[PDB]
Symmetry: D2
Subunit: 375 residues, 4 copies
């Protein structure tokens, strides 16, 4: 499994391409739209290729997401050349030479030899995550139909709220979570987070937060211990840290595990009727690079990403003079993290179970499951 996104924030459209998905997975334009809608939660889809009659074909799946604001940008972001005199009269084509702290602006301009930040922010912008969730929808359809696996998210903290550290939600809690204005699972934590936002809004300030993706129903043995790169945690870490504004990733109890003693840090195993059973999940469902059957828990730390008006000092690269950054989402981050987790899980599953069609993959899964049971 591979995935690619393309598109500028104010270009004509975004494109998501996924290659390597088995034929026979049921996914539709509506499913993609539903997931794009979930991305819009918190306080135009065209399938071009790879799917026929709601079922994947096995070839590359290309998904286009149109930008509604395109008529406003079709000259400033035109693909082809445009008379530079006609363009000099266009206010919105003014160059951006004041990099926002915390953004790709400054490093991107220097890296690519740009003197206008526009090409950098157009591509760096988190609007790109919409293309990711289009791709992620294919992965999650596969995960559900092949493995009975569900993926979801909930917000652990926003701003200075007290982190919810109770049990993670199951799939049936998703409607309640999605109806929450902060996509919180816990009512007390919800109230605390809403309060933090209210105070930040009034102060005209911005907040980041912590988000936890949960994947349920995974078989034992996805990922591997054979090298650093094959470890599922390594894979998960790359996929979620690569999301815009993410500054930290944890598996399970993460950094808090590093503060516990070995006697209380791990998940002990006990005899059960249908295999080994654990009573805690501090590992977050990954041990030694592989899924252990427990719920997968991955946490992502998002920094405040909205630029706070007239608060951040910067430099005008055109002049060398002082300036202030001019401005241009935790629950939605949760949704994007779901997507990223889904993509990697799906890739890991195809790696272990192979197959070119869903039925074949399903056969291999069943047979692996039977063999584990016959142990």
């Amino acid at each position: 499994l591979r995935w690619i996104t393309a598109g500028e924030s104010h270009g004509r459209a975004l494109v998501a391409v996924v290659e390597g998905m088995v034929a026979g997975v049921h996914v539709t334009s509506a499913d993609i739209a539903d997931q794009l809608a979930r991305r819009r939660l918190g306080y135009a889809v065209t399938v071009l290729s790879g799917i026929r009659h709601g079922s994947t074909l096995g070839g590359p799946i290309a998904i286009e997401i149109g930008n509604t604001e395109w008529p406003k940008w079709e000259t400033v972001m035109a693909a082809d050349p445009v008379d530079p005199a006609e363009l000099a009269d266009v206010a919105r084509n003014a160059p951006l030479t004041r990099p926002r702290p915390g953004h790709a602006d400054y490093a991107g301009m220097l890296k690519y030899g740009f003197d206008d930040a526009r090409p950098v922010l157009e591509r760096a912008s988190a609007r790109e995550t919409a293309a990711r969730v289009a791709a992620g929808t294919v992965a999650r359809a596969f995960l559900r139909q092949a493995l009975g696996v569900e993926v979801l998210s909930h917000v652990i903290s926003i701003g200075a709220s007290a982190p919810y550290e109770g049990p993670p939600p199951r799939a049936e809690d998703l409607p309640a979570i999605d109806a929450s204005p902060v996509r919180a699972y816990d009512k007390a934590a919800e109230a605390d987070m809403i309060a933090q936002i209210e105070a930040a809004k009034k102060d005209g300030d911005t907040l980041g937060g912590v988000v936890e993706a949960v994947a349920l129903g995974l078989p034992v043995g996805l990922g591997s211990f054979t090298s650093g790169d094959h470890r599922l945690d390594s894979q998960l870490a790359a996929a979620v840290m690569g999301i815009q504004a993410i500054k930290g990733v944890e598996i399970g109890d993460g950094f808090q595990t590093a503060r516990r003693r070995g006697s209380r840090a791990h998940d002990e195993m006990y005899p059960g009727p249908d295999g080994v059973v654990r009573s805690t999940n501090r590992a977050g469902g990954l041990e030694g690079g592989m899924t252990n059957g427990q719920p997968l828990r991955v946490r992502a730390a998002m920094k405040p990403i909205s630029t706070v008006p007239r608060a951040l000092a910067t430099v005008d690269l055109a002049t060398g003079d002082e300036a202030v950054a001019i401005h241009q989402a935790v629950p939605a981050a949760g949704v994007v993290v779901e997507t990223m987790v889904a993509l990697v899980l799906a890739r890991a599953a195809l790696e272990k179970f192979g197959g070119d069609s869903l039925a074949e993959t399903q056969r291999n899964i069943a047979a692996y499951q039977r063999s584990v049971a016959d142990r």
Copy 2:
């Protein structure tokens, strides 16, 4: 740049291979040995290929690290078949059927259809990190000679100690850090950590901790904002999360950034004589996926990895009965994290500056630096 490790913990030797390194980098067997020694800090090298007269050749560099304990294992871990009757009399060839919680044992056995955990732990074991640091030594020689970049580490916390949150060390502080029994930079933090260890030792328990790699002297613009996978933070996250026992990774102030307001979360920029200058480094030297010139800071959370005697319940997979796990390092984790950081930085540098020889790469670096200055 690519790197591969091979070797079982009790096999004849470990092998590290790095491919894609430019010719003309000065690295020697002694340098590799020095770095392997640093890995042994905390409370036989043969270069087979790719280096000639202390200078890289451009082809694959293969580095062998011999296992001193091999004569004890040369039958149990023999490559070739061995009479199963002769082997049944060998005590140390007894099968391991009681997976340690927190380790690859259980998931690995199920994944590969093993009924003895030996093949799993032999490869999963953190002894493998010795092969990594062999490979890492080539990367850091390159980083130093091509970019004047230095990489180091210090321990932030061990067990329940109070995290050192003062300034990171510079390269000249490395001797003092390496002489510390806990590789601490800060004396007060050092004392606190030693205390935590002393109490854990007496209790017969084990500790994890937090470690911070620091890379200094990086040019602006390594990594990219163009997609998730090209983000340097994504790359860093994969490389360090893939290290044994690591459950969390942060860039800069990490999870704490997610608890701050946007007005206080970022690093403001100011005019300077030789380019833009910042007064804080909350970003940890990465913004929007790229190096900004500030010190690179990456943090890794290590779980306690030593199995605590007769404390952890498990299952005997042979019988289905209850059992207890039988047993088989924070400052050293710091050293391994250095290695991983070095490897990715080196890869990112070769990606941007290209070249087949060090001189060529150095030319390209100089010219990129000149162009940035002429802005």
Copy 3:
């Protein structure tokens, strides 16, 4: 540099994506259209992302090519589900169960568990090569602007014609070649090929042939001898053999080299004013995996790809009974081979010279060239 194509032959559109191209390369929708036109030689483009005002941005370039016949196929090749009763009345949705010999039909159906060949031929079809040449246009713009490199093709033989073995064309011969109905460089060879086609047409039969891509102006040292995969010939071979209907690839004099004696097989070197000079090019501009500065010559053998009416016996997979294959281009193959060659050359150039913008890459090229001259 990476490239991806997506699209079914009768889907709404094709998509080409190229990732890793430096910013600042001048390419336009018109240039892509021109190259798509050349593909149509022999006896609707929308740039969605990655290019602004005729200049590459550095991010992923997505190029859409619309299918004009889409209204006819928008139900049979609909992405979303369609009432199976409404579909059963549609003649053109009849299933294809008689695999054509020489095509992906049979193996594809078995591989993916299809009982209709439609999903296989839709993706396998050489219509996909249109997406390739869209991507190839970006590479060749880069090659021209960064390296002064030109890529072209001419046909060596069609059917049983006598292979033209005279000198390859230069770039100024391209108009004459493109005006030839068989894209021949040599007039005598041209007449012979036209004759072979005329006789085949009259016999109601089909022809394959041999095609030679030529790349001019390459620097010494693209590709490498360090391993099999880094050899440029290896790379070239993969890219052109992967083209539909190609059964053979040669570099330079290819299979004929294997029939010569060592004394007459190679290209001897002689002193020249601006470096070493050769008087023959039997190697086809590659030696030991790298460009030697001579014209690059790559040859591809295309099998007859059009199914000959009622001539080819096959099986009806639905019944197990005998059947005949029902039917569903050498100069155009030449054009596609150009594309493939361009893509790999561009990737190899970016590998050696690095850079994130064209100017930077150009600096590195100049400096490498100066260093070679100062030898």
Copy 4:
């Protein structure tokens, strides 16, 4: 599946590493030695990791091949620095500044900024193919045990001999082939080739030739039609063209197919008791990028690789003056081609059938085979 080779021709040893091979494949140091012996046909192995008691472990397999001539080279090819005064007295450390035509010498020196060709030829040398066949032995053990697939080779032509175009050999013909001084299958062709060699030897000249690898017993559907890179022919082409001295690759009847009419170019299908049956194999067992069940045939054109004494003019790069190249194998090429074919087939099989152990892979294979039969 991935493979890496490392080693210089006169270094201490060669290393082959293969990663991604399933656990439970029976391969031994003896098997590797046997295959290294076959490579030595025509007119010290240590397994360091990844194999235990003659059975693969699932981790990276590292195989060391010692160089017997090492004591002669241990100063000239020393890894570590050596007094340059002590080295200046060593005759065999004299620099090589006269590139051989047809070799990596000239392009390699320029590419890496070397003024001595020694580092180039040490790595470029076909001695490296010994590391490949070590790796190839693991793949072929897997192919045999998982799929009942056998791989072999025979020589089609050497020098100006008349190409043997009769039927390819089966596995039982391998002893007779390996006993032939030119590894010919056909007695008449054998005599012709021996004659060509005799005449070349007497003339003090060198020969290249054509070689054909044959793989038998493949399932339908390895490789794919979904994109250029997934085509098995593309993969095969890269792997064999990347072999030293190979200038051409064909699948099946290759370039001759391009000279036939469509009515006679392909392999017609007929009804059979256990699936579809063909009476010709012009395709060489690949159609539309995938295996069709027929014998896989791949042909490689090897140029004469031995430098003919005082016959080839070149330049002394030290002076700019004329010079002559000073000197430093078709049946063995056949053996190496076998290896390369085996590696890719094995990778393609693991891609389709997945699995982490041989038993699991075998289950998936059986079930795929059953499903095809139940069609």
